[PDB]
Amino acid sequence: HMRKKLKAVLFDMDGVLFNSMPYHSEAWHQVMKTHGLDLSREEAYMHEGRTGASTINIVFQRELGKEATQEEIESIYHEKSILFNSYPEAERMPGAWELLQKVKSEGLTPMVVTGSGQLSLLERLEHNFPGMFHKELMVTAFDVKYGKPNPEPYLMALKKGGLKADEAVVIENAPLGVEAGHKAGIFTIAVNTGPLDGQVLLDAGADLLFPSMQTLCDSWDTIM
């Protein structure tokens, strides 16, 4: 019955639309090294979904026992962007385009809800997923004060789309993201695209779990 109440599907970008997480984790790891801090690739994955600013500050708290200054945030963030974009551009997660076609064909509105401030990725959405997304139906780092795992971004999305929590579904791949969608009170589907135990996504409050975007796409008509 939830099924025909649906009006919008809310996608995270990294690890859901683009296969960028290998790169994000590498870039975080490396830029932290340069600044003289230990952030493993694995921990970088655990931070997926946060804004850059929130990530940097938390790493500073866990490692040095203090806040990062505003200048430290901008400086590390700029460098992280350089490192990220110095890799061959991230490609589409297999299945993402085909699922978006299924979503659109069912008359549903695609939205992006992301902690990303990476303009290279944000501006590539249209080129990769043509006709799917619009700026006014997106939430990015630029919109939020807190970001995931706070529900704030997902609540902003509902409002931007003029939706009620029961008129939406969230597609997330990372625990902080699942958590934010869940706390926004939205039915949340986890897709385990990363190197994580699918359990951690269930623990974060995911209503359904899939191993890949392809599997999710294949089972889209089964979902209720």
Q: Which positions make up the binding site for Ca(2+)?
A: 12, 14, 48, 167, 173, 195
Give the 3-state secondary structure of residue 49. Answer: coil
Q: Does residue 174 interact with Mg ion by CB under 5 A?
A: yes
> Of the candidates 15, 95, 153, 175, which one interacts with Mg ion according to CB under 5 A?
15
Residues 80-139, interacting with Mg ion (CB under 5 A): none
- Closer Cβ to Mg ion, 14 or 179, answer by number: 14
Q: Does residue 152 interact with Mg ion by CB under 5 A?
A: no
- How far apart CA 153 and CA 181 sit, in angstroms, is 9
Would you call 15 exposed, middle or buried from its count of C-beta atoms within 10 A (0-12, 13-18, 19+)? buried
- Known binding site for (R)-malate: residues? 12, 114-115, 148
Size, binding site for Mg ion by CB under 5 A: 6
Q: Does residue 12 interact with Mg ion by CB under 5 A?
A: yes
Give the 3-state secondary structure of residue 178. Answer: helix
Under a CB-based contact definition with an 8 Å cutoff, are residues 69 and 53 in contact?
A: no
Stretch that binds Mg ion, among 47-55, 102-110, 122-130, 206-214 (CB under 5 A): 47-55
- Which of 115, 105, 214 lies closest to 174 in space, CA to CA? 115
Neighbours of 37 (CB within 10 A): 16
- Minimal distance, residue 182 CB to Mg ion, in Å: 14
- Minimal distance, residue 12 CB to Mg ion, in Å: 4
Tokens of 9: 């599907």
- Known binding site: residues? 12, 14, 48, 114-115, 148, 167, 172-173, 179, 192, 195, 211
- How far apart CA 86 and CA 191 sit, in angstroms, is 27
Where on the chain is the footprint of Mg ion (CB under 5 A)?
A: 12, 14-15, 48, 173-174
